[PDB]
Nucleic acid binder design. Structure first.
Length: 650
RNA sequence: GCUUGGCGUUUUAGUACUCUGGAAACAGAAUCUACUAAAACUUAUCUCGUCAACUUGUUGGCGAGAU
DNA sequence: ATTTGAATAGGCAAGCCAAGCGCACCTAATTTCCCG
DNA sequence: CGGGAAATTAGGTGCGCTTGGCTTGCCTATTCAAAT
C-alpha cells in the first residue's frame, strides 16, 4: 500500500517474527510469525550459502529472506528494517543459556532469602539490584572507599544511589555491568563524567591511583568483578571523542556477532545495488529486554508464537525513537552504517512512551505461517523386530518381550498377569512354568514387582519348570501384544523361521480424503508405500488400491485433498494444522493449534488434559476443507487436483 | 567401500528343558525358557500457460491469476 | 427396540535431545628455597 | 634479610555416560447417540 511503514524482525532458531507499523503515527498495521523445524526482482537465498554458518542459523536466514520478500510484495518497500538475532546459536546453546540465566536467577534470589531473614525488613525485596551491587564491591562505595553497613542501606535508601559507571547518555548501556552502588553526594559530584575524569578532578575524596589499585585487587581472586565492568571502571579515554562514543554505541546498540554482521551486509548490499532507500539496522538482544522492563511488558515466551511477533513490534517502535529525537541522530547514523543528551532526566524522557505500547499489547490480528514437509521421511519404520503368533480366536498378534524382570519399580508383568494372563505365550506353551510364576505373583502381590521380592528374600532367579531342577533362569518373558494390522514382513531373511518376523510403526507420508456418497473417508499412504527410483519417489499402486479396499472407498468417490505434516485443515468449521495420521484403522488424524502449541495453550490456562488434539473422520463429519497460508500467515481456502498424486520428483 | 567386537532385538542348527511311543539306546511331536555357533540392523494450495523428467497422464520447476 | 460406530482420555514404545554427576587433565596462586 | 622463580597442591574445566521429558504413531477400553 501507498502508506509508509517500519518492519521489525525477531529472527530465531525455529521462528522469524515480523511486525509492521505506520511510519507517521506508530499504529500497528500487521504482525505475524513464520515457524519451521530447527535444521539439526526480490532478495535471493543463494547469498546465505556464500558465507559459512551453522545449519541452524543458515535455515533461519533463508526463512527470514522469504518473509522480507513477502512483506515487500504485499506492502511495498519499507522505510526502515530493524532486526534482532536471538542470543543462542543452536537449541543446545539456547538451553545452556536459559540454564545459566536460571542459575543466575537462583543466585540472585538465594541472596534475597538470607538477608530478609537476617535484617527483617520488607522494602529489601523491592530493592532488587541495590542488594547485589553490595556483594560485588565488597561492602564499599567505589568512588569514596567508605564502608556500607547492610542495615544502613535499608535505613537510608536515599543517601545511596545506583550510578552508571559510563553515563547512559553516551554508552546506551543499562546492564548490571554498567552499574555501581555509590553515595548520593558522590553521584551528584561525578555528574556526566567517568570515574577517571571525576577522580582526576579537585572534587574527589580519593586519587584515581588508589581507586585503580582497589579495582585491580577486586578483579582477581574471590568476590570477582566482570571483565566488562572492570573495563568501564578503568575507562581512561576521552568520553567526548566521537571514536570512543562510536565504540560504546557499537558495543551496546549495534550487534557484534559474525552471523548478525553477515546478515545485515547481505541486506544492505542488496538495497544499495538496486537503489532502494531502505535503512537496515540491528539492536542488541539485551536492549529489547530493557524496553520490556521499562514499558512493563513481561516476556512470556509461553504466550504462543506471538511473543516473537510482539518482540518485532517493540523493535520497530525503538526505530521510531531513533528517528523522532534529534539528540539520537548520531546513534541513528551509526546504526545505518552511514559514512561521516546532557542529563539523566533528559535521557529518561526520550524513551518514555505510554501510549502506543497499549496498541501493541491490546493488538489482536496476528498471523502464523507453519512450513510444510513433503519429503518422504528417511525413517521408514521402527527398527525393532517382533515375532508373531495366532491366539485362541485366530488373531495374529505381535510378540513383545518383558525385560528387566528383577527391578525394584517395574509393574509391567504384575499388571499383565492380573488383566490378561492369556497374553503370555508361556500360558499356552509352558503351563507348568506359568503355574510356577503365578504362585510368586500371589505370594508377593502387595509390592510393585513380586519377582524383586523373590530375588531379595530367597536370593535366586526364577527358573523354567524341570523334572530334575535344572531348568534355565528366566531373563525375558514373551507375551502377545497388539493385534497385528499394518506391518512390514521380513521373515524371508530368517530361513525356516516357524513364526512370522515383522517390523511396526509404518511411518506416515500423508493422508488422502475422499467424499463417498455423502460420507468423508481417508487413505493413509506409508513411507514404506513410497519407493525411490532414479530421480523420483513413487507411491506403490497395488498397496494404494488395497488400502482403499480396506476403507471401502468406491470407484465413484470424489477425492477432496491430501494432507501432509503442518498442512491446514478446517474440520466442521474449525481450523487446525495437521501433525499426521493417529490411526488409519480408527480413522483419526492428529492436529494442533496455529497461534500456540496446544501444550502451551493448556499450560497458560492451567488445564490438565492430554496436550494433543485428535479429529475422527466419519459419517458425523459435515465438511472437510483444505486451507493454505502464504509465508506471512494470510489464510486461503484451497481446492485439490482431480486425483491423488503417485510420483514425487521432489 | 571393508573388517572386528561388547551390549540389545529376531531366527535357525545342535544340546539342555516339557509331552507321547520305548527296559534302555533312539525316533516323533511341541517350540515355550536357556547355553554354544552363524547371518542382518529445497518445497504453502488450486487453476491455466510453458518447459523437462518418464510413469504418457501424471509430476516437478518457472510465470500469471485466484484463493 | 438393540447393535454398531464416534469422540476423547490414558498408556505404551521408539527415537532423540539435553542436563547433571563423576573422573581425569589443565592452569594459576601460594609457600618454600636459593641468591643478591 | 627480602624478592623472584620453580614445584606442589587445590580448584576449575571438558569429555563421556545415563535418565527423564518431548514428539509422534497407534491400540485398547469406556461411554453416549444414531441406524437396521
Amino acid at each position: 500500500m501507498k502508506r509508509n511503514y517500519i518492519l521489525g524482525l525477531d529472527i530465531g532458531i525455529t521462528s522469524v517474527g515480523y511486525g509492521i507499523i505506520d511510519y507517521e503515527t506508530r499504529d500497528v498495521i500487521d504482525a505475524g510469525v513464520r515457524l519451521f523445524k530447527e535444521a539439526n526482482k526480490e532478495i535471493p537465498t543463494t547469498l546465505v550459502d556464500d558465507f559459512i554458518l551453522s545449519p541452524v542459523v543458515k535455515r533461519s536466514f533463508i526463512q527470514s529472506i522469504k518473509v522480507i520478500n513477502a512483506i515487500i510484495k504485499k506492502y511495498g518497500l519499507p522505510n526502515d528494517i530493524i532486526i534482532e538475532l536471538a542470543r543462542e546459536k543452536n537449541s543446545k546453546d539456547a538451553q545452556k543459556m536459559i540454564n545459566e540465566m536460571q542459575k543466575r536467577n537462583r543466585q540472585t534470589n538465594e541472596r534475597i532469602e538470607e538477608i530478609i531473614r537476617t535484617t527483617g525488613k520488607e522494602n529489601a525485596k523491592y530493592l532488587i539490584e541495590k542488594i547485589k551491587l553490595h556483594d560485588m564491591q565488597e561492602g564499599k562505595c567505589l568512588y569514596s572507599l567508605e564502608a556500607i553497613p547492610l542495615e544502613d542501606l535499608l535505613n537510608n535508601p536515599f543517601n545511596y544511589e545506583v550510578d552508571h559507571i559510563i553515563p547512559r547518555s553516551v554508552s546506551f548501556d543499562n546492564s548490571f555491568n554498567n552499574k555501581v552502588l555509590v553515595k548520593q553526594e558522590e553521584n551528584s559530584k561525578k555528574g556526566n563524567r567517568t570515574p577517571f575524569q571525576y577522580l582526576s578532578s579537585s572534587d574527589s575524596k580519593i586519587s584515581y591511583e588508589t581507586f585503580k589499585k582497589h579495582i585491580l585487587n577486586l578483579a582477581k581472586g574471590k568476590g570477582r568483578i566482570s571483565k566488562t565492568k572492570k573495563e568501564y571502571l578503568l575507562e581512561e579515554r576521552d568520553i567526548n571523542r566521537f571514536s570512543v562514543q562510536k565504540d560504546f554505541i557499537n558495543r551496546n546498540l549495534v550487534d557484534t556477532r559474525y552471523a548478525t554482521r553477515g546478515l545485515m551486509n547481505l541486506l544492505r548490499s542488496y538495497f544499495r545495488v538496486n537503489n532502494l532507500d531502505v535503512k537496515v539496522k540491528s539492536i542488541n538482544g539485551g536492549f529489547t529486554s530493557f524496553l520490556r522492563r521499562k514499558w512493563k511488558f513481561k516476556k512470556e515466551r509461553n504466550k504462543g508464537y506471538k511473543h516473537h511477533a510482539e518482540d518485532a513490534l517493540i523493535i520497530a517502535n525503538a526505530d521510531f525513537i531513533f528517528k523522532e529525537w534529534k539528540k539520537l541522530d548520531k546513534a541513528k547514523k551509526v546504526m545505518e552504517n552511514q559514512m561521516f543528551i546532557e542529563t539523566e532526566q533528559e535521557y529518561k524522557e526520550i524513551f518514555i512512551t505510554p501510549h502506543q505500547i497499549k496498541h501493541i499489547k491490546d493488538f489482536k490480528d496476528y498471523k502464523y505461517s507453519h512450513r510444510v514437509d513433503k519429503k518422504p521421511n528417511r525413517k521408514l519404520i521402527n527398527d525393532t523386530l517382533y515375532s508373531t503368533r495366532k491366539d485362541d480366536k485366530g488373531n495374529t498378534r505381535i510378540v513383545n518381550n518383558l525385560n528387566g524382570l528383577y527391578d525394584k519399580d517395574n509393574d509391567k508383568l504384575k499388571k499383565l498377569i492380573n488383566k490378561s494372563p492369556e497374553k503370555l505365550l508361556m500360558y499356552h506353551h509352558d503351563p507348568q512354568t506359568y503355574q510356577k510364576l503365578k504362585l510368586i505373583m500371589e505370594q508377593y502381590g502387595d509390592e510393585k514387582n513380586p519377582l524383586y521380592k523373590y530375588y531379595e528374600e530367597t536370593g535366586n532367579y526364577l527358573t523354567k519348570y524341570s523334572k530334575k531342577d535344572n531348568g534355565p533362569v528366566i531373563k525375558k518373558i514373551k507375551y502377545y501384544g497388539n493385534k497385528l494390522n499394518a506391518h512390514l514382513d521380513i521373515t524371508d531373511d530368517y530361513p525356516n523361521s516357524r513364526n512370522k518376523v515383522v517390523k511396526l510403526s509404518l511411518k506416515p507420508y500423508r493422508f488422502d480424503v475422499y467424499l463417498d456418497n455423502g460420507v468423508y473417508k481417508f487413505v493413509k499412504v506409508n513411507n514404506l508405500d513410497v519407493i525411490k527410483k532414479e530421480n523420483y519417489y513413487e507411491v506403490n499402486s497395488k498397496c494404494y488400491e488395497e488400502a482403499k479396499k480396506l476403507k471401502k472407498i468406491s470407484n465413484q468417490a470424489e477425492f477432496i485433498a491430501s494432507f501432509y505434516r503442518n498442512d491446514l485443515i478446517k474440520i466442521n468449521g474449525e481450523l487446525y494444522r495437521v501433525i499426521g495420521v493417529a490411526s488409519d484403522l480408527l480413522n483419526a488424524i492428529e492436529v494442533n493449534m496455529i497461534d500456540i502449541t496446544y501444550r502451551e495453550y493448556l499450560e497458560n490456562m492451567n488445564d490438565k488434559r492430554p496436550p494433543r488434539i485428535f479429529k475422527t473422520i466419519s459419517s458425523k463429519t459435515q465438511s472437510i476443507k483444505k486451507y493454505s497460508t502464504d509465508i506471512l500467515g494470510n489464510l486461503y481456502e484451497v481446492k485439490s487436483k482431480k486425483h491423488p498424486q503417485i510420483i514425487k520428483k521432489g
